[PDB]
Design a binder for this molecule. Structure first.
Ligand SMILES: Cc1cc2nc3c(=O)[nH]c(=O)nc-3n(C[C@H](O)[C@H](O)[C@H](O)COP(=O)(O)OP(=O)(O)OC[C@H]3O[C@@H](n4cnc5c(N)ncnc54)[C@H](O)[C@@H]3O)c2cc1C
Ligand SMILES: Cc1cc2nc3c(=O)[nH]c(=O)nc-3n(C[C@H](O)[C@H](O)[C@H](O)COP(=O)(O)OP(=O)(O)OC[C@H]3O[C@@H](n4cnc5c(N)ncnc54)[C@H](O)[C@@H]3O)c2cc1C
Ligand SMILES: [Cl-]
Lengths: 338, 263
């Protein structure tokens, strides 16, 4: 068993450029920010890895945000993420250029891509990591939550390369863009084309023209089973409009037909870190909390004073959301204007 | 149609709690269970069996007491169970675990469909299913919200942060499962049949799996340390006035004073 073993000549830290509408998603910039620090600790370069149908002016944006190097592999087949296409491209580049470590944002698609690459190369992969450090020789120290957030683990990949990890979004800070940075773009030509075995028969945007998704909203107005009916979600849309936020819900709300799956918050849904999370008729199961417990402020509106959500809420009302919501929205609207 | 479901026994980590006052991990009500996402992977399989006829084999790699989750699988209708149990598999990271499971599957013959849970709620990596798919050279779809079979193709609903999607792929293929209906009930009759079944127990030598690709030996990663994280207690200000307008005035005045609501 010698496959993936270190040569000793690996070098540089690579960040996967996940993109949407051609543009990097924000966790790419978060990783460039943190990995800049790690690269400096070990005197290696920071590279961004761009697998795309059209590089546009993305490479210069990546360099302004920290990248020394941008590897670009461009083909029409890369328009949308696919396991088969993207694993092949990335693994061809790892083989050609021999990085020391690779960092992938632990998005839905990053959690798909990372283990495929790791198994193909035969190397180590640490999941959804929240703390990172590096020795002077480039050995990365991967620190992650496990057991539903109840255990932290620190993990090494000592002898196989590249050292890989997926990294939790919304953990690390991006650098401000710096137009004085310079770097080098490397165009990489695919050796082997593949046929994607997986066909997309439906691809629909979950949020409409110029509307707010929960993923990046500064306020999330969320409902659960205690919202009682789909029509009562209008109350949360009103609140969200007053604040300039978005509407989410629990998995129970999805199951009762109150909201669609793309608005689900929790371990099986989205993880959000808004300035304010309003939890309305949501008990606070651990599976829901997993998606919102790092919100800056949680406001709980629940009829049950013993609801577990109150345990983590800085503010709250014990009462009937259906009575409370309209009064709260109106009071906030009045404070705002004017 | 032949289906294999990879099922893991785990502590019920949803019952673990860190007390924000002492910062100690409390494990009241924590028992070993069938991993919840595997319950959904199983129920998906059993729904395919009921619709189409499918032979369903469950496989778990664990110590001898992991046999109980296999009995549970049989009790709800799985056809066959296999226990992969050998200290040589112990200390495995996700690469070593997926190698063991891939080589076990290949030994018995790759089926038409392999179903795994999206993640195990202890490790929480979500890496074994895709790594298995790579080891076997098969296409994947992860985090399924619904799985159907149309002829020789599997149709899977899967979202990402921006898009709601549906994918198809030809069998043989691997699917990892984020949701199904809750696993069906096991009746007394079901549990008795399961208790009488033969569950073979397989060592690495029996399966001819080289020692150096399994267990710690086959693991690129090593956990060097684990610890309970710091939890900072929140002392919330909760208004419980009978008149909702009074509660709302109190809340809003405090949100404004504390610079939480602005403008
Ligand atoms: C493997 C797995 C994954 C999961 N993934 C997720 C996930 O991603 N996200 C998620 O949310 N769940 C998830 N769950 C489910 C979770 O276990 C809970 O079932 C769910 O979070 C409960 O949703 P809820 O709080 O809306 O409903 P409930 O627990 O039923 O709580 C309803 C609440 O509404 C309150 N209430 C009632 N009427 C009123 C009223 N008029 N005004 C105000 N309050 C009122 C009640 O007091 C109660 O607190 C998962 C579970 C499993 C096992
Ligand atoms: C605190 C801690 C942290 C860890 N962190 C890492 C890490 O970052 N990287 C790493 O490589 N390893 C890690 N491990 C080791 C890891 O938990 C084991 O390798 C485990 O066997 C598989 O990973 P998982 O538990 O994350 O499962 P997942 O990869 O989340 O499992 C996904 C699916 O694979 C199937 N499956 C997994 N295990 C079995 C099994 N034993 N039998 C049958 N089917 C199975 C099930 O269908 C399951 O739902 C960690 C262990 C600990 C205790
Ligand atoms: Cl393949």
């Amino acid at each position: 068993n010698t496959k993936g073993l270190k040569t000793g000549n690996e070098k540089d830290l690579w960040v996967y450029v996940e993109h949407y509408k051609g543009e990097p998603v924000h966790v790419v910039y978060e990783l460039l920010g943190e990995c800049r620090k790690l690269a400096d600790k070990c005197n290696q370069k920071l590279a961004a890895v761009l697998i795309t149908d059209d590089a546009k002016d993305v490479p210069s944006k990546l360099i302004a945000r920290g990248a020394d190097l941008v590897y670009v592999c461009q083909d029409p087949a890369f328009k949308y993420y696919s396991t088969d296409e993207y694993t092949n491209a990335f693994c061809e580049m790892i083989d050609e250029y021999q990085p020391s470590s690779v960092f992938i944002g632990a998005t839905n698609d990053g959690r798909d891509l990372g283990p495929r690459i790791a198994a193909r190369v035969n190397t180590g992969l640490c999941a959804d990591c929240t703390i990172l450090d590096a020795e002077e020789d480039g050995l990365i120290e991967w620190t992650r939550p496990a057991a539903g957030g109840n255990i932290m683990a620190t993990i090494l990949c000592k002898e196989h390369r590249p050292q890989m990890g997926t990294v939790r979004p919304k953990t690390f800070k991006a650098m401000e863009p710096d137009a004085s940075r310079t770097g080098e773009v490397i165009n990489y030509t695919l050796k082997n084309h593949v046929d994607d075995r997986v066909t997309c028969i439906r691809r629909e945007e979950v949020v409409s023209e110029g509307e707010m998704a929960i993923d990046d909203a500064p306020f999330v107005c969320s409902g659960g089973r205690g919202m009682k009916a789909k029509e009562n979600f209008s109350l949360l849309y009103d609140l969200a409009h007053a604040l300039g936020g978005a509407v989410g819900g629990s998995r129970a709300a999805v199951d009762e037909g109150f909201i669609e799956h793309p608005r689900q918050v929790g371990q099986s849904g989205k993880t959000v870190t808004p300035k304010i999370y309003f939890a309305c008729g949501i008990s606070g199961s651990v599976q829901h909390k997993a998606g919102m417990s790092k919100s800056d402020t949680i406001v709980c509106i629940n009829k049950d004073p013993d609801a577990p959500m109150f345990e983590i809420s800085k503010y709250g009302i014990v009462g009937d959301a259906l009575k409370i919501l309209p009064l709260l929205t109106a009071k906030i609207k009045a404070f705002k204007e004017s | 149609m032949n289906i294999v479901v990879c099922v893991k026994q785990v502590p019920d980590t949803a019952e673990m709690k860190i007390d924000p006052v002492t910062n100690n991990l409390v494990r009241d009500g924590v028992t070993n269970i069938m991993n919840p996402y595997d319950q959904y992977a199983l129920e998906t399989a059993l729904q395919l069996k009921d619709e189409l006829g499918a032979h369903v084999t469950v496989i778990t790699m664990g110590p001898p007491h992991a046999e109980s989750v296999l009995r549970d699988c049989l009790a709800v209708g799985a056809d066959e169970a296999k226990l992969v149990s050998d200290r040589a598999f112990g200390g495995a990271d996700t690469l070593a675990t997926s190698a063991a499971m891939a080589n076990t599957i290949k030994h018995f013959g790759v089926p038409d469909l392999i179903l795994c849970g999206r993640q195990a709620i202890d490790g929480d990596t979500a890496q074994v299913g895709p790594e298995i798919a790579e080891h076997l050279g098969l296409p994947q779809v992860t985090a399924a919200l619904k799985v159907q079979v149309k002829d020789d193709t599997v149709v899977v609903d899967r979202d990402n942060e921006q898009m709601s999607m549906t994918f198809t792929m030809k069998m043989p293929c691997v699917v990892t499962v984020m949701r199904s209906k809750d696993l069906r009930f096991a009746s007394i009759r079901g549990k008795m049949k399961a208790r009488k079944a033969e569950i073979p127990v397989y060592t690495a030598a029996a399966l001819e799996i080289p020692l150096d690709i399994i267990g710690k030996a086959g693991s690129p990663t090593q956990v060097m340390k684990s610890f309970t994280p710091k939890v900072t207690q929140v002392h919330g200000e909760i208004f419980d006035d009978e008149d909702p307008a009074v509660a709302v005035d109190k809340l809003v005045n405090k949100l404004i004073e504390d610079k939480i609501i602005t403008k």
